[PDB]
């Protein structure tokens, strides 16, 4: 948008005291990410900068009441959120407000926290023999530990050796600990460092096709940490075994317990293991002096199954800290809303958990873990009233918060609310602007709005 207009007199080089409308010029097909700009000058190198000055500002989402003229030109405007007078003229859809009290909007504070406070976590899944065992398994044969009804809390795995992969295929790591499956199997084994990439759905690799075959649609996780500190024996580490020779590839999640001889030629061997007859089993070589690609890595995968059975394994719960004397979002396992949590003296029964009233609304809940009766009450709210003596008289206004003690939003407390913007005088005049409870406001004298 743009608009060109001259000046009327020699200004002090400030923004003029006038109103002007801006018309659109161009609507180029753009939309690239733009967050920073810069203005170019015109240096007259006879280097001279000349004389320039701009008033770059920032735009904000606001509502405006635009006045159109008989010819379609914008003449006036209201900010609708700057001062209570502008809000009154905005909600009245006019520009010359009369003398009296007007309700503009409703005062209401916003919550601060988002506490949950879910119940405790009792049933812990068995993860002490699959992440802390001495020797998990070999590569030619792997183990499988069926897990039962529990809540799979993967946050406890932070105590392992750092710098370990946690690439979860299918599922999302952010939403990982909210998932009710039916069964989860753990397959742990130890391989080299250059074979961690081979453990993936459908990827080329000798160990990925002759030892362990992961399916292409595998939706689980894979964990592999460095084991060079404890699984590296300098005196001939050969306790691990991995297959290298086989007739064909393995099926997804297949157990190759066959130990038959391998034949790369055409002559019968019949169990000799000599020339042209090799043994399809080779042992690793783990030495603390080898490179990272040769260090041992305990790889454990978690296959997740999904059936229409009673969900045995699920995810843990947050159970955040509880805050009192502040309107926050309460999520006590059965409700979602706003309210102030305060200690209540209402004695409940051992089987009761919620609480109603005459209005049929929740007003007291029992904490899940630490049994204690609370008192849910909505935050402070009311009606914002603006006392205006009229635009033709002045522009000073007074705000009246109906039913608010104006302690958590001159200030004077009345029985009808709280008036902020008018002083209370001890005199007694005729009522000009009715407020309530015998309080009246007037624009008298140093002119200002007074209450009496």
């Amino acid at each position, epitope marked *: 948008y743009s608009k060109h207009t001259p000046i009327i007199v020699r200004e002090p080089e400030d923004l003029p005291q006038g109103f002007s409308a801006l018309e659109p010029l161009v609507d180029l097909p753009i939309g690239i990410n733009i967050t920073r700009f810069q203005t170019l000058l015109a240096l007259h190198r006879s280097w001279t900068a000349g004389a320039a000055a701009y008033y770059v500002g920032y735009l904000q989402p606001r509502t405006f009441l635009l006045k159109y003229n008989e010819n379609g030109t914008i003449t006036d405007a209201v900010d609708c959120a700057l001062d209570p007078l502008s809000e009154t003229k905005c909600t009245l859809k006019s520009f010359t407000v009369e003398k009296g009290i007007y309700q503009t909007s409703n005062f209401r504070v916003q919550p601060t926290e988002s506490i949950v406070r879910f119940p405790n976590i009792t049933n812990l899944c068995p993860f002490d*023999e699959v992440f802390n*065992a*001495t*020797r*998990f*398994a*070999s590569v*030619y*044969a*792997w*183990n499988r*530990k069926r897990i039962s009804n529990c809540v799979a809390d993967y946050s406890v795995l932070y105590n392992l050796a750092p710098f370990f992969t946690f690439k979860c295929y299918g599922v999302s790591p952010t939403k990982l600990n909210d998932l009710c499956f039916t069964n989860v199997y753990a397959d742990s084994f130890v391989i080299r460092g250059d074979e961690v990439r081979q453990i993936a759905p459908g990827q080329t690799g000798n160990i990925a096709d002759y030892n362990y075959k992961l399916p292409d649609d595998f939706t689980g996780c894979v964990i592999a940490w460095n084991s060079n500190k404890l699984d590296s*024996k300098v*005196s*001939g*580490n*050969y*306790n*691990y*075994l991995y297959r290298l020779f086989r007739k064909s590839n393995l099926k997804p999640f297949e157990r190759d*317990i066959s*130990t*038959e*001889i391998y034949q790369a030629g055409n002559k019968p061997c019949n*169990g000799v*293991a000599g020339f042209n007859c090799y*043994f399809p*089993l080779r*042992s690793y070589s783990f030495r603390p002096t080898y490179g990272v690609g040769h260090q041992p890595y305990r790889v454990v995968v978690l296959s997740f199954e999904l059936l229409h059975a009673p969900a045995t394994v699920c995810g843990p719960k947050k159970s955040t800290n509880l805050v009192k004397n502040k309107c926050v979002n309460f999520n006590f396992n059965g409700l979602k809303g706003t309210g102030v949590l305060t200690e209540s003296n209402k004695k409940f029964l051992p089987f009761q958990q919620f609480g109603r009233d005459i209005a049929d609304t929740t007003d007291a809940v029992r904490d899940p873990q630490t049994l204690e009766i609370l008192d849910i009450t909505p935050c402070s709210f009311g009606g914002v009233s603006v006392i205006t003596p009229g635009t033709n008289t002045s522009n000073q206004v007074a705000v009246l918060y109906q039913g608010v003690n104006c302690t958590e939003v001159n200030v004077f407390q009345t029985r009808a609310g709280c008036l902020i913007g008018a002083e209370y005088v001890n005199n007694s005049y005729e009522c000009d602007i009715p407020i309530g409870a015998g309080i009246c406001a007037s624009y008298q004298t140093s002119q200002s709005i007074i209450a009496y």
Partner: nanobody, 118 residues
Framework: EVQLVESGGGLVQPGGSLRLSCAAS????????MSWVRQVPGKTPEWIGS???????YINPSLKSLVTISRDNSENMLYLQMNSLRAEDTAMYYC????????????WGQGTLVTVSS
């Protein structure tokens, strides 16, 4: 419910051999994988032999053509004959049926006292 394994041992006999044999009780042993693991203080894991069901065995690349294992089923007792006894062989040998790729229902014995020192 019963091990009935690791019955034997030896004394300091340099330049000789070990006739250590560990039997097995009558049970449902079909896919068993017997092996020998030392228990020298400082080096807990150790692999010596193998008992694959197909009859073939695997020897470690270190002691190539040094340890010989033979299967015997006359009185249900496995044999093991090795030669060229070193001086650092002081350890506690075991006959474990649940070798690597196990540790879920793994069980061990009591230990065969075998030590040599020149």
């Amino acid at each position: 419910e019963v091990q009935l394994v690791e019955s034997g041992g030896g004394l300091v006999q340099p330049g000789g051999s070990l006739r250590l044999s560990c039997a097995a009780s009558d049970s449902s042993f079909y896919d068993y994988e017997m092996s020998w693991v030392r228990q020298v203080p400082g080096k807990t894991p150790e692999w010596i032999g193998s008992m694959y069901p197909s009859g073939r065995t695997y020897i470690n690349p270190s002691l190539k053509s040094l340890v010989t294992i033979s299967r015997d089923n006359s009185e249900n007792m496995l044999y093991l004959q090795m030669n060229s006894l070193r001086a650092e062989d002081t350890a506690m040998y075991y006959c474990v049926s649940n070798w690597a790729s196990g540790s879920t229902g793994d069980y061990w014995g009591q230990g065969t006292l075998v030590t040599v020192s020149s």
